[PDB]
Structure formats: structure tokens, C-alpha cells
């Protein structure tokens, strides 16, 4: 988990980490290139406070007058069936479609849920067009207003590209307020200065400048209207109260004072400069999400790789087994590769390591009480028969006579791999229905005598206790230089602990990443309980990255 | 309790955790889907302070005038017998019912507790209807008012759906003010700006906009009736004081006060009349559902950890080996009246018993005799299961096995192997039977079996009798193995009496039932009695924790 280990596993998993980081950056870049650009326009309003004005601008009288001025409750979008059709259309350089509807009146379904009757325009040419509400397509021409089925459309200046689809939505006036008010924004930047910087953000650049100018003009007009409206209510009741006659003349003097004031009462709000749209979109923020894509890919990659590190629990190196006090006799690397590897590809790495095992056993197998070696995998799929068979081959070619007993009576398949006469296997001998001679075979490849399990017997462990088995071993250890026995795991059945009574040397075979140290520890302790002293293990299937062996020649 | 152990038990208990988290999330879904929506409407009120205004709008003078204006003390609900009938009615798309009562006068029961006389409207059609107060159903039609039994009711524009029930409550004016006031709210957002955000929240969307509009109008008229009242008091005194140049000056002031009074532009303007946000603000969807998820998750965690800190039994042979107990086996639970070792010989729980046979055969050599005693740490430790199957799995090997069931209190081996209940073990110790008529032969396992026989009155006094050692000495010569079942030592002392003659003694501990304390005390009490317990035999270990697996 150290920095060195970190970089090691990173370069080892460089494919995964770069793949995930690159794919998230691909999502980021496609999103940055497909998200519609959003321009921002600004204006400067000057007054002589400004705290009421930042709230009166965003009031519904102001926005509500712009909406009715520009008909912004008539919403128009070019149709693109995919969620990214519009973005790719912009990327291709296609000029976006746009039309002007000066007067819209839907059939006004205006239901509780679907209060936005949605219609689609099919552009037929630059002059005529067709409108489908729910299938009923009404063909129409710009100029002439379409008044059918309670549906009133006055659409003019339709765009060029025909065949397009334009979704029209007569969303409610309150909605046409709320969206704008969401986009609209005000500030002061002087905390007392009359300057207000209105900002409106939107997609259609030319539209937002007009909308902001409309807001500014409405604000100008309404402030002119208010100061005058004070005097206007005064004037209204003066007009209502005119009938004493000298007082009538005094009221006429006040009337003439008030009347002109209304026309002349223009002030207190100022458009220092009308709205213009900044050509550079402010959103989507390029180079701010792509770096977020990079960092998101990096963080998720590390949080996944660390999770996988804390996932696996199998053996990782012989040092783990030697920590418990287990003499790992070999580390057989996994070979890329029906005949024996030790005779098919005699110079493979996995066979060089088995020769390295042969020498170490040859040293460790003298002083053993007899020349019978028992090899029991830690579990199925630990390769016990692979290692035992190749070891038998590599010891046969040396020149010693080897007998390879496959005492895995439960699911042993060595006879399925050496070529066999399935009759008269091992089990058929223990049952007493076969003699010691008709069971041995000759693997022509390895050159070592082979004894197969034969038929699966109903009672394996009961058979192995029969005293004929020790007779077999006593005879063979006199007629052979080495005897290798295959036995089932000790975590599953007790066959291994029965055969181990007669074996001089016993070894476990542990698959590299499959079997855990717990399985080896429990297996060795369970062998000891049964009076069988496990000599050591033979780590197997170690990946070539962690295997010390390499080609030499 | 470690992260690995945490996730292991979570996946093991994945059914429980997902079940409870899912059902609380379902409760959250149904609540969020049935909780009646509440809309809020907004209006904007300007002044040129606003600190008095935020408390004068909420005064009873203003609210109580809207109440009397819109008849808000006349409360109406569509009736739904369940607590969720209204919600599901909305779910089904059914348009909610509503009527209009322009004039309600109940009998005015107005008791101390039931100061809110409640009646129910039964909609008969679009024109007529019936009202039951306490059973007395009065039929009436819109238009004509029902004035009977002191009940003056004028309902018009009754809804369409007939047969419905409408609960009508003439709640007192103070309550009809207080509810509006708890829903009502004010703010300023400028701290000196005249801008006030009136906000009112209700369920009926169209109603609350009208309510807030009426509040605004009442407030506006009240502001007129303060300032126009100042000018009107001045003008009223002029009108009362008018009795010639001074008269013309007073007439000038008269018309000036006329215009100043009647103009009376309020310091307040309604910026924009109240409108209702179509999106309900409560119930807050996706804010309680996530709270439902986190609540289910936290309660699942706190319950699973509690159950973790609930069980005290053995959890693995390592716990026994820590104390210094040689766990000779771990027999897993078998799914499965004949012996398992002859019924289903390939069962995992029998493979483990063969594994025990081999370890005993090694560990039982050098023992002073071939007698094995197996005593469970408690009843329901499966002692007889293990001993019987072990005797079977040793019998098929070919050794002659004698199986003595010395559980003279509640032994039931004869109830399992098929029996001649006469002449059991007790009938031998009592001296009324000889050693030969007590022995049987289980045809299945193939081992000679000695039943306890009749429950004696004094078990322990019998077992001390010297005939028992005669039996064992004779058997150990005529049999290759002798297995003795004995009662738990924590309950009676028979086990420590038989153990004097047993070469090997083993305890059987159920996996999660028996604790480490029971095993430790059992071995200490065996030691005090001069019986050296060889080791334990963990029993009934669950397949999740056992290393055994099928092979073949």
C-alpha cells in the first residue's frame, strides 16, 4: 500500500486507470461541446438607495409587462429527437431554426397537469407550413391567420429550412414570469451608487438583448408613471370635485400646476447603456468541467482500485506462508498452455520450476521413513494433479522408476488425461476384485507407472482404511524408487488424513490467488490432529509478474 | 465487528436489512404520495420602517375583516373515511369536491368542548341535497335557504358529484383568525425597503390567492381610513364650523381638504396581487424520501449491531482453542428416523464425523482403555446425534462397537434405534437383569447398543454401584470401542461418575447455543472430579462458517 506499491499497482493497472479516466474525460468533453451555449447580456441603470429597486425590477408587474410586450409565453424550440440533437446540429455548423409568432391562441386545453398545450410546426417551405396538434395537421401560410378548431395562429417570417419540427408551448403567464425571473439578476456594486447592473442570461443571443431592453424600458416608463400617478390621483379627484367660485379658480390654479407636471415628470432612473450581449458564452463553462472530468475519473479510479486491493484475500507471495512457519518448497509459475507439459514443452517456465522442486524434494526426501510422497491440494482447482503429474514426469526422465497413484477416489481424472484402461483402477483393487498387477499402467509420455482410481466407489474413506492399501504401498515402495499419491483436500473429506499415515513426505498445493492462508493453516492443523506432519506447501499458479523465474537461453 | 465482518454479516443478513429499509422507504413513498399538497401564494407590498406593518397586518383587526368578508369561519371538507382517502382520491385523478355556502347559521350548540357544531352535507344531485346534523336529514336545494330547527343554511353552486359527504364546521371567529394567522407570514427582504413579501400557504390553490388579495385590500382600505381620516377630521370640523373674506379663505381650505382627503394615496401599494405557485411546497418530495432511506439505513445498522451484541454462544473453534480446548471436529448442520450415517452416507455432516473418527483413532491410542465418554455441554447439544453417528461410522469400518446410553434421566436412544425397552441399563445396575439380555443390535449402524431402560428413581446412586465397572471391564474385552452417553455435568453429576472409568472424554457444544463459559465451567468441574476432558466437539456449525463442502 506504500507509495512504491501504489505506483507499481498503478502501472500494472495502467490500462484500467487510463481507460476510466479517459472515458470520463470523453463524457466531459462531449458534454462541454454539446451543452447549449448560454450568453449573458448586461445593462447599466443609474439612480440617485437602490435597495427597493433591486426588488421592484424583479416584481411581477415589470416582468409581466415585458412578457405581454414580447409574447414570451409563446415558446418556440427546434425539434431534435435525441437529447443531444441540438448540440450536434450546432457542432455541424447548421444555422439554428427560428420563427416569429406574433399571435398565438391554442385550443386552450389548459388541464390541471398539462396546462401547457404542446403543438408541433412542420415547415413545408419558406411560405406555407403545417401544424399537427394531436395528428390533425392544419396546413397554413404566413400572413393569413389560421383559425380552426379553436386554434388561432398568426405565424410569420418562418425560417428557411423546411421539413423541420417546431414545438410550440403556450405556457402560463406565471410560468413565463418565473423562468425569466430565474434568469434575471440585479446588483449595485457601489452599495449606495445609483448604478445597477442588470444581467440577463439565455441561449438565443439576439433575443436576450431585446428582452433586457424591454425590461429597462418598462422600468423607465413605470417610474415616469408613478411619480406622475401621485399627482394623477390628485388630478382625478380635482376633476371629480369641480363644481366657492373663487375657490374654484384656486382649484384651477392647482389643476394647471398638476397637469403639466405629469407630462414633465421624467427622472430618477437612467439607462446609461442599453443591453448588449457578450459574444462569449458564460455557460457551459469549458475548461472547468473537463478538469472536473479528469479529477472525477482520477478519484473514482483510485477509490475503485483501493477497493479491489482490499477485496482479494488469497495468497500473494510465499513470504505470507513462511510467516506462519510453512516451508514453501516451490513457486510454480502459471504456464500459458492433453499430454503432459513436462513432455509437450519441456523447456517451459512452469517445468523449470518443477525441476527446481524436484531437486529441493530430492534433498528433503532423504531421511524420510519411506519413499512415498503424498501431495494434497488445498482445495479443488489448486492444480494438485498438474503438479504431481509433471513432477512424476520430470523425475521419470531422470532415470528413477516412479509410480503415480491417483488416490482421489471421489473425482479423480488422471486416467482421463494419461490415456487409460478404466477397468481395474485403484478402487477395484481395494474391493479385492483386482490384483496388484492389473491396476498399474504405463504412461508412454512421461515414462512413469500410473494407477488410476477406477470406478467411483460408494464408500471411499471406508475403502482407504482397508489393509490392502498398505500392502500395495509396501510392495510398491520395494519395487519403485518414488511413489506419488494424489489425495482429495483435507478441508472436504478425510481421505488425505487416512493416506497420510503411510506417507513419508506430505505437501500441500496452494493456488496462488484462490486459496487463502486460512485454508492452508487449517489444513495443516487438521493434518497434525490426525497424526500427519505436513512437510510444506507448493505454491502454484503464481502469476509471471510475481514469479522470479524467467526464460534463460 | 470489523469492516470485513460488517459487510459479511450485512450480506448474510441482506434479506433483513433490505426488507426493513425497503418497508420504511415504502412508508415514505406512501406518505409523500398521500400527504395532502399545500400550495403557497405570494404578494408584494411596498411602503416608503415596515416594522410596525409586519405586526399590523397580522393583527386581528385586519385578518378578522377578511374572515367576515369571505365567510372563512365556514369550513368545508370533502369527507373521506380513511386517513388517506383524500390523497388516493387525488391520485385517481378525481376532481376534488367543493361547494359554496354564502350563509351558514348552525343551531349554535357551541358547547365548552364541542364549540364547533359539525354537520355533514349529503349531495343528492346538482340542485338538491340533504344535511344530517345528528341523524335528522333535512333535504334542501340551492337557492332556497333551509331554516329549520334553528339551522339557517344557504348553500349554492353545489358541486357535481352526488352522494358525497361534506363536513361543515362553523368554527369560532377567533379560531378562524388563528388558523389564517398561523398560515400567514410576512417579511421585508430589505430591512428598510417598503417591500413586504406577504405569503399565505393553503391547500385550495384558488382560495388562498383570494384570501391574500382580500388581506391586501383590507390593509389598503385601512391605510386610507387612517390618513383620509386625518384629513376628514379636519374637513369635518371645517364643515361643522362654517358660519366673508375669512369665509372665502375657509372655503379655499375646504376644497384643499376635500382633495387631500379624497385623494388619500396610501403609503402602501399592492405591487402585484397574490398569485399561487402551481408547484406545491409541502409535502417536500425527495426530501423525506431520502430521509426515509437514511432512517431505514440507520435503524438497520443500530438493530444489526444490537443483534451482534445479543448472541453470546461459540462462534468458531478458535474461541474454544483460545481457552486451551482441543476442538476435535466441527460437525455442520445437516438438512435432514434411521441414522444419518446409514440414511444419507454422503452427507456433509457425516463426512465431518468420519473426519472426527480419524482424529479420535489417532488421539485415542495410548488411552488406558477403549472406552469413550461423550457428554454434551447441555441438553440440545446434539450429543446423541454425534455419538450414534460416530458409532455407525466406526462400525462400517469393521470394529465391534458397543454404544451404552448412560443418560439414565431422559435418554431416548431406544426411541431412535428400535428397541426392546425392557432390560435396559438401569435394569442391569439394579441387578434384575444380566449383562447379556440388555445388549441389542441396531440393524442399521451395525453396532451393539445398550438402552438406558426404565428411568430409575436414583440415577447417580445407581451409577456408583460396582456392577457398572464390571460391565465396562467385560465389554472393553468383548468390544473394540465403547461409547457412553452421559448427561451434562452442569445439570447432574452422572457424567463425572462414569468418567472415572473412561479413557477418553469429549464435550459436545452446539454451535451458537452453548457459550464458552459453559464449556470452561464444565471442564473445571470435570477436573475437580478427577476426570480429564480430552477436548471438545463443536457441533451444529452453520454452513456459512464451516469449511466443509460437497466434493464429488
Residue numbers in the entry:
A (entry chain C): 17 to 64, 85 to 279, 384 to 477, 494 to 709
B (entry chain B): 17 to 64, 85 to 279, 385 to 477, 494 to 709
Pull text from the paper.
Gram-negative species couple polymerization with translocation across the periplasm and outer membrane and the master regulator of the system is the tyrosine autokinase, Wzc. The tyrosine autokinase domain forms the cytoplasm region, while the periplasmic region contains small folded motifs and helical bundles. Autophosphorylation of the tyrosine-rich C-terminus of Wzc results in disassembly of the octamer into multiply phosphorylated monomers. We propose that the cycling between phosphorylated monomer and dephosphorylated octamer regulates glycan polymerization and translocation.
Reasoning the negatively charged Glu would mimic negatively charged pTyr (phosphotyrosine) and create a protein resembling a locked phosphorylated state, several Tyr-to-Glu mutants were constructed in WzcK540M. Analysis of cryo-EM images of WzcK540M with four Glu residues (designated WzcK540M4YE) revealed ~50% octamers, as well as other state(s). A 2.8 Å-resolution structure of the WzcK540M4YE octamer was determined using the same approach as WzcK540M. Overall, this structure has similar octameric (rmsd 3.1 Å over 4520 Cα atoms) and monomeric (rmsd of 2.5 Å over 651 Cα atoms) arrangements seen in WzcK540M. The core kinase domain is unchanged between the structures (rmsd 0.4 Å for Cα atoms 452–697) but the tyrosine-rich tail has undergone a large change that now places Y708 at the active site (compared Y717 in WzcK540M). Motif 3 still possesses the same three structural arrangements seen in WzcK540M but only two (not three) monomers have the fully ordered class i arrangement (rmsd of 0.4 Å for 133 Cα atoms). The larger rmsd value for the monomer and octamer, compare to the individual regions, reflects shifts in the relative positions of the regions. This can be visualised by superimposing the core kinase domains of monomer for WzcK540M and WzcK540M4YE, which shows a rigid body rotation of 11° at the other end of the molecule. Superposition using all the Cα atoms in octamer reveals shifts in the periplasmic helices, particularly those in class ii. Comparing WzcK540M vs WzcK540M4YE revealed the distribution of arrangements changed, suggesting the helical bundles are particularly sensitive to changes elsewhere in the structure. The structure of WzcK540M4YE, chosen to mimic a phosphorylated state, showed a significant conformational change in the tyrosine tail, which would be predicted to weaken the octamer.
